[PDB]
Structure 1
Amino acid sequence: GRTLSRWVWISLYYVAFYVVMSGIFALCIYVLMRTIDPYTPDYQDQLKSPGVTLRPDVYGEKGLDISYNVSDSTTWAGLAHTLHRFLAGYSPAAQEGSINCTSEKYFFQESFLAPNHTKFSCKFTADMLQNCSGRPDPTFGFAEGKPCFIIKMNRIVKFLPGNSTAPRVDCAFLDQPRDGPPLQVEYFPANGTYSLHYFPYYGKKAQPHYSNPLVAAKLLNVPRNRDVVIVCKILAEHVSFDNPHDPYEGKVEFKLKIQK
Structure 2
Amino acid sequence: LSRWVWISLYYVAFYVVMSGIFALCIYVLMRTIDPYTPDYQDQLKSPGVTLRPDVYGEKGLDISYNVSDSTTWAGLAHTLHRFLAGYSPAAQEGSINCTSEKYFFQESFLAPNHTKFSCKFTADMLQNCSGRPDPTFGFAEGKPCFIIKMNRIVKFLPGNSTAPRVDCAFLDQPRDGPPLQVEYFPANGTYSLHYFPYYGKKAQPHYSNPLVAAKLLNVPRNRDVVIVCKILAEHVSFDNPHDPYEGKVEFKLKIQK
Shorter-chain TM-score: which interval?
A: over 0.9
> Aligned pair count?
257
CA distances 1:96-121 after superposition (whole Å, capped 9, x unpaired) = 10001000000000111112211100
CA-CA distance at 1:221 after TM superposition: 1.0
Percent sequence identity over aligned pairs:
100
Provide structure 1 residue ranges, at least 5 long, that are not aligned to the other structure: none
Query: Secondary structure in 2 aligned to 1:131?
Result: helix
CA distances 1:145-176 after superposition (whole Å, capped 9, x unpaired) = 00000001000110001101010000011133
Cα RMSD of the aligned pairs, angstroms, is 0.8
Q: Does the 8 A contact of 2:172 with 2:226 survive in 1?
A: no
CA-CA distance at 1:196 after TM superposition: 0.4
Q: Does the 8 A contact of 2:173 with 2:180 survive in 1?
A: no
Q: Does the 8 A contact of 2:155 with 2:198 survive in 1?
A: yes
1:169-184 to structure 2, matched below 5 A, reads 169-176=166-173, 178-184=175-181
Provide structure 2 residue ranges, at least 5 long, that are not aligned to the other structure: none
Equivalent in the alignment of 1:57: 54
Q: Residues of 1 paired with 2:174 and 2:80: CA distance?
A: 31
Query: Secondary structure in 2 aligned to 1:187?
Result: strand
Q: Residues of 2 paired with 1:107 and 1:190: CA distance?
A: 22
Q: Does the 8 A contact of 2:118 with 2:204 survive in 1?
A: yes
CA-CA distance at 1:29 after TM superposition: 0.2
Q: Residues of 2 paired with 1:71 and 1:178: CA distance?
A: 27
CA-CA distance at 1:60 after TM superposition: 1.5
Q: Residues of 2 paired with 1:137 and 1:195: CA distance?
A: 25
Q: Residues of 2 paired with 1:135 and 1:177: CA distance?
A: 31
Query: Secondary structure in 1 aligned to 2:118?
Result: coil
Q: Does the 8 A contact of 2:172 with 2:225 survive in 1?
A: no
CA-CA distance at 1:177 after TM superposition: 5.7
1:61-210 to structure 2, matched below 5 A, reads 61-176=58-173, 178-210=175-207
Query: Secondary structure in 2 aligned to 1:128?
Result: helix
Query: Secondary structure in 2 aligned to 1:190?
Result: coil
Q: Does the 8 A contact of 2:97 with 2:119 survive in 1?
A: yes
Moved more, 54-63 or 173-182: 173-182
Q: Residues of 2 paired with 1:36 and 1:94: CA distance?
A: 31
Q: Does the 8 A contact of 2:121 with 2:208 survive in 1?
A: yes
Q: Residues of 1 paired with 2:244 and 2:81: CA distance?
A: 27
CA distances 1:155-204 after superposition (whole Å, capped 9, x unpaired) = 01100011010100000111336321110000000010110000000000
